[PDB]
Amino acid sequence: VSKANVPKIDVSPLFGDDQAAKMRVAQQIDAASRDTGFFYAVNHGINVQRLSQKTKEFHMSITPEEKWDLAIRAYNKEHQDQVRAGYYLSIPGKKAVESFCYLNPNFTPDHPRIQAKTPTHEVNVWPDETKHPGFQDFAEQYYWDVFGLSSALLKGYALALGKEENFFARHFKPDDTLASVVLIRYPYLDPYPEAAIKTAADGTKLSFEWHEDVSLITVLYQSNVQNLQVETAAGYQDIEADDTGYLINCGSYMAHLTNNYYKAPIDRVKWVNAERQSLPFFVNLGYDSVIDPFDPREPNGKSDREPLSYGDYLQNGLVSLINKNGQT
Numbered sequence: 406v407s408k409a410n411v412p413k414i415d416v417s418p419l420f421g422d423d424q425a426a427k428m429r430v431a432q433q434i435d436a437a438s439r440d441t442g443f444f445y446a447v448n449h450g451i452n453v454q455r456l457s458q459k460t461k462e463f464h465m466s467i468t469p470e471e472k473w474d475l476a477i478r479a480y481n482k483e484h485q486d487q488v489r490a491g492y493y494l495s496i497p498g499k500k501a502v503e504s505f506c507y508l509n510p511n512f513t514p515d516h517p518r519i520q521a522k523t524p525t526h527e528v529n530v531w532p533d534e535t536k537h538p539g540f541q542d543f544a545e546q547y548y549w550d551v552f553g554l555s556s557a558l559l560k561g562y563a564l565a566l567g568k569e570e571n572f573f574a575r576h577f578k579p580d581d582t583l584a585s586v587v588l589i590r591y592p593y594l595d596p597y598p599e600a601a602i603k604t605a606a607d608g609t610k611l612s613f614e615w616h617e618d619v620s621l622i623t624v625l626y627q628s629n630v631q632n633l634q635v636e637t638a639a640g641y642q643d644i645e646a647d648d649t650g651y652l653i654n655c656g657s658y659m660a661h662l663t664n665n666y667y668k669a670p671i672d673r674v675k676w677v678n679a680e681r682q683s684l685p686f687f688v689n690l691g692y693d694s695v696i697d698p699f700d701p702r703e704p705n706g707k708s709d710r711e712p713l714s715y716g717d718y719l720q721n722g723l724v725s726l727i728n729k730n731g732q733t
């Protein structure tokens with residue numbers, strides 16, 4: 406098994422006013438997006454130390470009673486409104502992974518998409534504040550911290566494609582974004598149940614099978630345990646870990662709108678018997694956001710692909726990923 410070229414890109418100029426320097430970042434994003442599809446964003450400004458600390462404290466202290474009380478509908482029939490947000494239980498002996506997903510903190514009973522019961526919009530559920538002091542505040546501020554990083558990365562992608570720097574970010578708004586954070590725990594288990602391990606076609610033991618991301622882009626922090634592999638024509642390649650940088654890649658919505666000039670890379674999660682953390686931020690737009698496709702490889706730049714409304718893309722994509730790779 407070979408190793409993916411995953412360049413480390415200093416993205417801090419995307420926060421600044423040096424336009425030529427932003428173009429030099431944009432070039433690097435273009436190159437990475439045309440090669441393996443991945444890059445590490447470094448010099449990003451986010452306190453990833455605290456993020457890993459607060460997440461571990463939550464995972465290791467939440468009780469079975471709290472997990473039922475917060476469980477999504479797939480684990481608790483009482484919670485019919487929780488399709489996306491809430492706790493995703495492990496099944497000891499069968500399923501090792503467990504996680505907690507939350508959405509836009511601005512999705513409240515006051516929000517018109519909650520009032521209208523629009524699919525993919527939900528009000529976040531939270532544990533008792535006194536049982537998990539500071540957790541909700543941490544989690545909501547992390548959402549906006551990584552929102553700000555993601556908005557800057559979207560400026561880099563727009564420039565990389567020959568667009569004005571707000572081409573994507575103008576659709577990425579705090580009042581309506583469908584973006585999600587998932588706080589994933591992968592446990593150490595002894596013995597590790599074979600029922601929780603899948604075997605790939607090439608024989609590799611996996612915790613999660615191949616898939617394209619359902620996102621515009623994916624902004625991922627993981628603890629320092631190597632596990633990801635990207636598919637290339639030469640086979641699956643190991644993605645090296647970096648627990649200070651953010652692993653970035655395009656989702657299938659970007660592959661659609663660029664006429665596949667920036668492909669959505671296929672990745673999978675190797676089985677590793679180790680306590681670790683996987684904390685993705687899925688950069689989703691608003692429910693009615695439509696980006697007109699284009700083809701940066703054509704002289705006239707024209708694409709015949711349908712402009713796709715993002716909310717319907719997200720709803721169909723999330724169900725499809727569950728049907729293909731199982732309920733997480």
Ligand SMILES: CC(C)[C@@H](NC(=O)[C@H](CS)NC(=O)CCC[C@H](N)C(=O)O)C(=O)O
Nearest residue numbers: 489506585589613618625674683685687733
């Ligand atoms: C590969 C990582 C990003 C991570 N996998 C994942 O997060 C996988 C594959 S991208 N993602 C999903 O299943 C979609 C979660 C969507 C979320 N409930 C929501 O409603 O928005 C892992 O470590 O398993």
Ligand SMILES: [Fe+3]
Nearest residue numbers: 616617618672
């Ligand atoms: Fe993925």
